Ligand binder design. Structure first.
Ligand SMILES: *[C@@H]1O[C@H](CO)[C@@H](O)[C@H](O)[C@H]1NC(C)=O
Ligand SMILES: [Br-]
Ligand SMILES: [Br-]
Ligand SMILES: [Br-]
Ligand SMILES: [Br-]
Ligand SMILES: [Br-]
Ligand SMILES: [Br-]
Ligand SMILES: [Zn+2]
Lengths: 195, 596
């Protein structure tokens, strides 16, 4: 009875910035999906292609868990066929995505009175991300036509911005922790079952 | 390139630094307003210093994008907002002369004393001394020395400062392509929006004058009825066919006739509706008041209050030693943070103003979807008009019966209705000629149509003619009586109190027609009309992203000011006043003076 390390992913001390989102490979274990009570008043559990009810009855070869922190009104962008800064430049799910998206409020853990600037996101990129792509580039974004030289110069921008998180923010501006469970099935072995 | 696309990227970056920098200024400002402290003054000053610093840097950045090259009106309207600074164009030696004068005028007004000639030991400030005399005294002579003394002591000191103030303010306006400082002030109504939604600055004078001519007949009958009632109090000084003396109108300037209600009440045997005793009877607290206000906005399809609104607002004077000055305000700190700061009491007044302040909040929540630079009322008068119409529906007997502060058996007398309409007219209708004449005088002074040898000659010529108010003592050109008002001495535009008065009845009539309310407009209650809310939301969500004419059209259907909703509101009083004045002179002759 090998329990899959879900305590590592969901109950981690700190999550990754969405531009540098964190993927945790899970294999050869017993997946107990029933431990997620709410751990937040405002909480989201959306699944695509698979049914979360009777989810701990199926088997998959590999199960990838992506985790990061975004704002409350960017949670809708973690879904197939979505557009916006987070979907376009930070984390993109495919149209035929199979899996579940779990989001919950983290105002008590991630907001600070003096402002929490540790969580970052990408604000400019030349093109949208391909599905499941991860861009941690720090190259200066050339908006104009004069090359941006590496720093000082007009119409140049550092591509990454800071999520300021203060506890008095509205729900839409509050930090939400996101876990994306990608289910992979090449049939044959299906080493991750979890009765 | 297509610099718009370059400016969109600049605005994309600006909307993150600006939105949260402005939030720190609000938080520091909230800390001082909810905890007055020497330390908290420093944080508020420094946070605002940071915010004003950043903003003026970004204006320069935004000024490197030709506004004649952008097709997006939203991008254009955002870049447009980042410009229009002010006295920065003024020379350094003239810049500090102006702010010298402004701080001098503000101080000698707020500190000016007036001494009773009968008692030299009795020297009173405006607040609370002279205000108490003008709001309550019925003695002709006691009102006279306070009125003349205020305009003689602080008025004469402001006269040479104002002559320099006009010259300096004009030069800064001329260095901003504006004709004069009055033309500069009318820029708050200029709109260059699409098709026939544009609004020139010169149009404001015509539309205000056009609207006032339609208000004049109603004001004259109110003026005559008040005059006839004041005869029974000042028989030796009231001319039945002449202008009312200025010092007998209920405050220091005659700005509001609200305090003449006791002397002018139609039916003094009928008390005004006051549900304060009911609210204490049912053991209401401050939390209950705002809960009922929240239900009212929910009933019309508007969103609830946010969770942070209940947790972070100050809905009660603190009892833990924190020092705050009790002044009702509704805050839009940004980043989803909406708060109301009220020392709420269990009174009908604070019940009404709570709906008014939450009316401000609903406006702020609606246009939060707009970019930061467009999060404001359509013009300077939209916000207070939106808040006022919430108090109108709340105060109706229709609403109070549904809330449980009136018996379901409640019988409202037609006499009590006229008593209520008369009190409304004293505040609402009485201030309109005062507001219009005052701003018209300042407009012409900046325009240079009133030479400084005629400043006090015109002022009382207009006060006699337009307002029907005559000075009790002749004043030469050493006086400056307009400067004896707070707004004039503190460099504030004044036409907003005229426009938002017209806006609110335009709003209410349109919302009541949508709600299909049958009967007099003043009895209408938009509660439980989701259709009224959507028509309201169609304008609230716009913010300042569209010309105020277009935002006005979304709710009321017309793209300009209209006073017929205001006259419709006061129609029962208009017919009652006409019957009461059928044996009284309606109008005034500008020749008579109390010192004639
Ligand atoms: C996280 O911790 C809470 C309480 O400490 C627990 O109930 C929950 O099951 C934990 N989550 C996971 C994924 O183990
Ligand atoms: Br649950
Ligand atoms: Br005093
Ligand atoms: Br208050
Ligand atoms: Br004029
Ligand atoms: Br005056
Ligand atoms: Br109506
Ligand atoms: Zn208000």
């Amino acid at each position: 009875t090998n329990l899959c390390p879900f305590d590592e992913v969901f109950n981690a001390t700190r999550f990754a910035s969405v531009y540098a989102w964190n993927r945790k490979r899970i294999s050869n274990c017993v997946a107990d999906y029933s431990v997620l009570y709410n751990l937040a008043p405002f909480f989201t559990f959306k699944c695509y292609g698979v049914s979360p009810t009777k989810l701990n009855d199926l088997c998959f070869t590999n199960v990838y868990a992506d985790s990061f922190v975004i704002r409350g009104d960017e949670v809708r962008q973690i879904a197939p066929g979505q557009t916006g800064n987070i979907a376009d430049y930070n984390y993109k799910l495919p149209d035929d995505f199979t899996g579940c998206v779990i989001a919950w409020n983290s105002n008590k853990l991630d907001s600070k009175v003096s402002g929490n600037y540790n969580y970052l996101y990408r604000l400019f990129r030349k093109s949208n991300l391909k599905p499941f792509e991860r861009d941690i580039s720090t190259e200066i974004y050339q908006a104009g036509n004069k090359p941006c030289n590496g720093v000082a110069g007009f119409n140049c921008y550092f591509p990454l911005r800071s999520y300021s998180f203060r506890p008095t923010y509205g729900v839409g501006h509050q930090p939400y922790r996101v876990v994306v469970l990608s289910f992979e099935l090449l049939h044959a072995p299906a080493t991750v079952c979890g009765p | 390139s297509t610099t718009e696309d370059l400016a969109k990227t600049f605005l994309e970056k600006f909307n993150s630094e600006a939105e949260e920098l402005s939030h720190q200024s609000s938080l520091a400002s909230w800390s001082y307003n909810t905890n007055i402290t020497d330390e908290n003054v420093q944080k508020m000053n420094e946070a605002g210093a940071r915010w004003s610093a950043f903003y003026e840097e970004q204006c320069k950045l935004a000024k490197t994008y030709p506004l004649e090259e952008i097709q997006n009106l939203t991008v254009k309207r955002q870049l447009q907002a980042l410009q229009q600074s002010g006295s920065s164009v003024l020379s350094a030696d003239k810049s500090k002369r102006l702010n010298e004068i402004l701080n001098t005028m503000s101080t000698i007004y707020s500190t000016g004393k007036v001494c009773n000639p009968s008692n030299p030991q009795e020297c009173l400030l405006l607040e609370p001394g002279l205000d108490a005399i003008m709001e309550n005294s019925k003695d002709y002579n006691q009102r006279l020395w306070a009125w003349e003394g205020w305009r003689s002591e602080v008025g004469k000191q402001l006269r040479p400062l104002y002559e320099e103030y006009v010259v300096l303010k004009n030069e800064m306006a001329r260095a901003n392509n504006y004709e004069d400082y009055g033309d500069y002030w009318r820029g708050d109504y200029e709109a260059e929006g699409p098709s026939g939604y544009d609004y020139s600055r010169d149009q404001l004078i015509e539309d205000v004058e056009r609207t006032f001519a339609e208000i004049k007949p109603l004001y004259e009958h109110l003026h005559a009825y008040v005059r006839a009632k004041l005869m029974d109090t000042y028989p030796s000084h009231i001319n039945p066919t002449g202008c009312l003396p200025a010092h007998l109108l209920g405050d220091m300037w005659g700005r509001f006739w609200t305090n003449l209600y006791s002397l002018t009440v139609p039916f003094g045997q009928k008390p005004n509706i006051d549900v304060t005793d009911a609210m204490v009877d049912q053991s209401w607290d401050a939390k209950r008041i705002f809960e009922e206000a929240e239900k009212f906005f929910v009933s019309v399809g508007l969103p609830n209050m946010t969770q942070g609104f209940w947790e972070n607002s100050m809905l009660t004077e603190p009892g833990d030693g924190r020092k705050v000055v009790c002044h009702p305000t509704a805050w839009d700190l940004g980043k989803g943070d909406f708060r109301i700061k009220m020392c709420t009491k269990v009174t009908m007044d604070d019940f009404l103003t709570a709906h008014h302040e939450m009316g401000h909040i609903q406006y702020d929540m609606a246009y939060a979807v707009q970019p930061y630079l467009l999060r404001n009322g359509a013009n300077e008068g939209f916000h207070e008009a939106v808040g006022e119409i919430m108090s109108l529906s709340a105060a109706t007997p229709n609403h109070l019966k549904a809330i449980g502060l009136l018996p379901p058996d409640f019988y409202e007398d037609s006499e009590t209705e006229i008593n209520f309409l008369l009190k409304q007219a004293l505040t609402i209708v009485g201030t309109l000629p005062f507001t219009y004449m005052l701003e018209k005088w300042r407009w012409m002074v900046f325009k240079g149509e009133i030479p400084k040898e005629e400043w006090m000659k015109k002022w009382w010529e207009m006060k006699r003619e337009i307002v029907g108010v005559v000075e009790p003592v002749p004043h030469d050109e050493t006086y400056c009586d307009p400067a004896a008002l707070f707004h004039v001495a503190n460099d504030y535009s004044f036409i907003r109190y005229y426009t938002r008065t017209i806006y609110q009845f335009q709003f209410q009539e349109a919302l009541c027609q949508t709600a299909k309310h049958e009967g007099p407009l003043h009895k209408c209650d938009i509660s439980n009309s989701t259709e009224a809310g959507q028509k309201l939301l169609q304008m609230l969500s716009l913010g300042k992203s569209e010309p105020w004419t277009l935002a006005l059209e979304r709710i009321v259907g017309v793209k300009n000011m209209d006073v017929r909703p205001l006259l419709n509101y006061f129609e029962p009083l208009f017919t009652w006043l006409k019957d009461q004045n059928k044996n009284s002179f309606v109008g005034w002759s500008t020749n008579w003076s109390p010192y004639a």
